[PDB]
């Protein structure tokens, strides 16, 4: 009652017919896997961002009016 | 005794050297891969007659024996006992196998047929490639014919097919015969029993100081 004990025969044919998809990689992949002491921290970075938006907005408008003046001084 | 050479004529398998891995190898039939005046010199003995295989095959140890002996017999006659060297250049050495004869008694009842198919050591054989030398001989330049035919008889202990060829080298060196007398007289080459040392413009100068001295 003996038989075959493997083969990897047509096969190439199969796990290949539908393709072999090189894994569709998004931007913005998961941070799960990373050392907790990164995340522990970068969440205090991410959480206390808005504290410091007043600077951010004014300091934007400074650069925006300085570059409205740079492009207008070119004109 | 053994199956006829036929069945182990051809190299199918990877070399089985007698080692740790196989053991209980019966000692190789052949034992002397040179005879005659192996006490010769390079300078008195100038004819590297050769026997060369033309086929990718295996040669049994027991063929090599016969092949040798029948060349010791014709040379002797021919040259005399002192008047040659013969060298065999295939010491049998990958080991050949035998399933253990499918032994059974009378009508029998069980052999198990194929289980543990792997055999045992039977003997020993040489690998031989094409254009590769099996036997070589040296004599006097005089005595070419008497090499030719000695290897000629040896071909007939010996399967497949194989040419007899006469070399361009001093006897048993690698140095092309048109060239010794010169290369010795100036000492690129220095006598060393059978062979010869090639001495180059390399080592310390006090090595040279000994020659041309």
């Amino acid at each position: 009652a003996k038989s075959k004990n493997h083969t990897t025969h047509n096969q190439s044919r199969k796990w290949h017919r539908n393709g072999i998809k090189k894994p569709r990689s998004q931007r913005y992949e998961s941070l799960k896997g990373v050392d907790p002491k990164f995340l522990r921290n970068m969440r205090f970075a991410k959480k206390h961002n808005k504290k410091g938006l007043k600077k951010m907005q004014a300091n934007n408008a400074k650069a925006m009016s300085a570059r409205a003046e740079a492009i207008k001084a070119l004109v | 005794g053994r199956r006829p050479a036929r069945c182990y004529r051809y190299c199918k398998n990877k070399p089985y050297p007698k080692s740790r891995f196989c053991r209980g190898v019966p000692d190789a039939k052949i034992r002397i891969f040179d005879l005659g005046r192996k006490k010769a010199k390079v300078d008195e003995f100038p004819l590297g007659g050769h026997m060369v295989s033309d086929e990718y095959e295996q040669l049994s140890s027991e063929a090599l024996e016969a092949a040798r002996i029948c060349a010791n017999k014709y040379m002797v006659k021919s040259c005399g006992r002192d008047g040659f060297h013969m060298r065999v250049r295939l010491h049998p050495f990958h080991v050949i196998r035998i399933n253990k004869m499918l032994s059974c008694a009378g009508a029998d009842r069980l052999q198990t047929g194929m289980r543990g198919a792997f055999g045992k050591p039977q003997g020993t054989v040489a690998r031989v490639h094409i254009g590769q030398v099996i036997m070589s001989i040296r004599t006097k330049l005089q005595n070419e014919e008497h090499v030719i035919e000695a290897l000629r008889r040896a071909k007939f202990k010996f399967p497949g097919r194989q040419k007899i060829h006469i070399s361009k080298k001093w006897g048993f060196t690698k140095f092309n015969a048109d060239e010794f007398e010169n290369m010795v007289a100036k000492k690129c080459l220095i006598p060393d029993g059978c062979g010869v040392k090639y001495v180059p413009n390399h080592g310390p100068l006090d090595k040279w100081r000994v020659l041309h001295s």
Partner: protein, 292 residues
Amino acid sequence: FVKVVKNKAYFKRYQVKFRRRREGKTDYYARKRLVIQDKNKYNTPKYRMIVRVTNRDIICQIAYARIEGDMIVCAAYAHELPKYGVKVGLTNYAAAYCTGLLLARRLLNRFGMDKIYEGQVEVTGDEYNVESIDGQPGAFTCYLDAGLARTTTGNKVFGALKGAVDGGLSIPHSTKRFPGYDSESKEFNAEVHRKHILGQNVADYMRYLIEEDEDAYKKQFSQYIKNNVTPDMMEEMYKKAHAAIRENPVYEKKPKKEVKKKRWNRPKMSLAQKKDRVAQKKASFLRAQERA
């Protein structure tokens, strides 16, 4: 005869050690563990204070390690110390202090910190361990490098350390080896470090030797006689140094330009000049014995 150990085979297979090994200068495993900076840092360095007491001069220097070759930020030697009123006995544990102290302050003049984390001043010989001030530049730090000195109690290396700690670097040092630790009890005297820092080792040797015999004095330390140095005095050279060092640590160099620039090595012989010497011989030989 024997078998020749040193075959061709010996040298085909002989695999060299690893240069600063052959010369016999460097734990590197241990340089490994000292130097290489963790990779939750990527660029930021790892400073080590390097002290090797030579034999005549103690060298101390802070170094950080780059892939091209560890860069030295600051270096303070012992043979500078004549400047600071210390003429002699300058490979001596008490001068390793001044040197290490120097180093700490020549460093701390840069990154403008000579006005903060001064460390201990009067000098005790205790736990001084710098505590970084909040709202300021946080203190400097480095992981002492002994090199190859069997660091027993008393040895100058981790003694120069005491200097750089006293001088305001934040090295992790324990006290288990400062001259003063009692290896059958496990404390300090600390007032042994008093002495050991200011050289009343050498004073009290300069006093056991003198009253016994003359001319072992003078032999054992001539330059301690010459330069009109004495015991009693000693303690109050060094105290001028850990003061004088600390009012001015900075190096001024000495400017350098003159040299004529002669070549008084010997040069490599060119090919042809070896090429003949064999042809120059062998014509010296041949000629010589085509005769006799």
